[PDB]
């Protein structure tokens, strides 16, 4: 069996007490299961925090207390902070295997300013000669990572040839995203200008480039 289940997403505020669970399918999480707690930071920094269901690493503060609540495990964070916002995994020991949970995405309220700066690039002369056109709209240094992308060509809505990625955390714990507009070299030179519209929590940022 060996199915580990836990929460998928939680949220808290600095100063509050959090508690993450780790449920087992084959029965109760016993002390013989040696519950583990990892911390997924940006750039894939999976730092191990607690082992043996209570034993804590030497560089982890005392706010992380490992326990066994009810029929499962527990990760109590008494005095949550802004530096505790990450994905936390659980690992239960079964006599032969090492299985993992899905991960509990912990959200923390902080990071005062997340206003995005937008950069737009027209296609390259080498790309236009290669019978291709691709404009790049780069959104970076914003928080939270929930934005809506809109492209405009000559005051008309554009929704064709647009693929855009979900924002991911940067090295500075801010989010970044990229939007690309694939076209043909004829459509690029037939319009007056192209605009990429980015809106994030009321403020709207749109930049315009022209073929001159």
């Amino acid at each position: 069996q060996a199915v580990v289940t836990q929460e998928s997403a939680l949220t808290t505020s600095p100063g509050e007490t959090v508690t993450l669970t780790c449920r087992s399918s084959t029965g109760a999480v016993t002390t013989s299961n040696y519950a583990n707690w990892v911390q997924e930071k940006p750039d894939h920094l999976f730092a191990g925090l607690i082992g043996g269901t209570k034993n804590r690493a030497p560089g982890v503060p005392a706010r992380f207390s490992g326990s066994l609540i009810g029929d499962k495990a527990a990760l109590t964070i008494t005095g949550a902070q802004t530096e505790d916002e990450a994905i936390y995994f659980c690992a239960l020991w079964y006599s032969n295997h090492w299985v993992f949970g899905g991960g509990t995405k912990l959200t923390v309220l902080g990071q005062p300013k997340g206003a995005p700066s937008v950069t737009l690039f027209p296609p390259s002369s080498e790309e236009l000669q290669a019978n291709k056109a691709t404009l790049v709209c780069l959104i970076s240094d914003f928080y939270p990572g929930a934005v809506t992308v809109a492209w405009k060509a000559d005051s008309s809505p554009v929704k064709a040839g647009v693929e855009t990625t979900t924002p991911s955390k940067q090295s500075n714990n801010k989010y970044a995203a990229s939007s690309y507009l694939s076209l043909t070299p004829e459509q690029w030179k037939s319009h007056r200008s192209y605009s990429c519209q980015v809106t994030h929590e009321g403020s709207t940022v749109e930049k315009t480039v022209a073929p001159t």
Partner: protein, 282 residues
Amino acid sequence: TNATELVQSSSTGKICNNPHRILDGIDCTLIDALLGDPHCDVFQNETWDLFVERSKAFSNCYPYDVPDYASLRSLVASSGTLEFITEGFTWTGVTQNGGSNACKRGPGSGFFSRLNWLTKSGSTYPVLNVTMPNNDNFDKLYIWGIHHPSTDQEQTSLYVQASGRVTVSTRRSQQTIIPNIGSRPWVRGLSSRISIYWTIVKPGDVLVINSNGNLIAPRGYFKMRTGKSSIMRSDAPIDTCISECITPNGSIPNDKPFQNVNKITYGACPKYVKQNTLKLAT
């Protein structure tokens, strides 16, 4: 005029090897050397005035658990010696001198040098009733343990009986432990652990050991002493110097009345404070 200083804020970064005797645990701790870890064979029957445990130490043998680890690491440190006397207990029908390939003392199997693994002798495991008196005029230190298998099938495979027990009593003390079997996570590849215990024997006292399974036997005792010795956790090197005061951040002089490097000291070290400079006029 001027103002003389009364606080030692600076350190050497290295430990001065005089005038005390320093013993370096380069790849070994004090418990690794106390048990006789095959990679700790340098410290057998050695002496010291201050032990140094490094962050680069490791254990290449059976994963061991020491209840009262800090209470054992401190009483042996002030002894200042691993003075081990082989005794020769009566292990009749014991199939002694056992080991595993994880505690590798050479090519094949191996075990710790100061303790002995007692398996079964065919298909029989008798009950243990052995005694070893302390007729000398000094305290004895006996180190023993108990085996925690991975499953009941290897508990019955190593020892005839499904459940063990080890009772080590004296004229004033008694210790009875029941093993807890379980497939623990693989540390150095083994799903099994061992808990380490000890018993101190005084002059006029006699040691008694009783067991019906899962016993790790000693090969003797340790001669305890009352010395000015201690143990320090440092990664500072050893230099060919002479300094009375020792600090985990490096030895410091004793000319000033106070220090500011570390509260953990050894020797004729000054008092501890947190102020940086303290100047008096002269």
